[PDB]
């Protein structure tokens, strides 16, 4: 057990580092990578989950800064909290 991770504990910079780690697979193991993807999903609260990273919608920018901006905009549009 582990409580939900919250995005407003992260600055935009910190979140961009986390997304870049995922996109580069800059982890020690596959298990560590899937743990980070899970945490990313918990933080964004976005219904598409890991698809933001791996199966982007046509027209979406799937670079790390692209994914961060997609999350930021979606949270803004849906009345959710932003970064620290």
């Amino acid at each position: 057990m582990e409580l939900k991770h919250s995005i407003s504990d992260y600055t935009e910079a910190e979140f961009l580092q986390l997304v870049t780690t995922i996109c580069n697979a800059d982890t020690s193991s596959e298990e560590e990578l899937v743990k980070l993807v899970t945490h990313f999903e918990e933080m964004t609260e976005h219904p598409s989950g890991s698809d933001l990273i791996y199966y982007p919608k046509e027209g979406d920018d799937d670079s790390p800064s692209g994914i961060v901006n997609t999350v930021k905009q979606w949270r803004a549009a849906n009345g959710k909290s932003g970064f620290k």
């Binding site: 697979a25 899970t38 598409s48």
Partner: protein
Amino acid sequence: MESKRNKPGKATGKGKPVGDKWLDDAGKDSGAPIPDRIADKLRDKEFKSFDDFRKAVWEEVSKDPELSKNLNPSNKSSVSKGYSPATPKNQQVGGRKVYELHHDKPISQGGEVYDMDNIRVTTPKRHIDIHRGK
């Protein structure tokens, strides 16, 4: 019992020809076969365990332009490391988020561990659906 998947063995088998959309088939039927070009690279090599073989499969996927062309940049990074690529969210099961290698004939019923003609690539969802119908 001692676990055969945790002992070394020698990869065998032919695999099957697949197209650049092979991983879509992993969510249907009995999943996708091991691609023939991957079998060609691994056949007769010794692996320390089934997990070591699994890493070798995804390493070989990363090296094959046609079998990796459909992966997005993030999934290409994963397979470059020998990690299994993430499936679409709608094919995940809890913390099982990546493609899985499963044995078609169970090892306990005579299936071989490293026989590439006995291995299927499935999404977690398709695996669980198959298993639940047994």
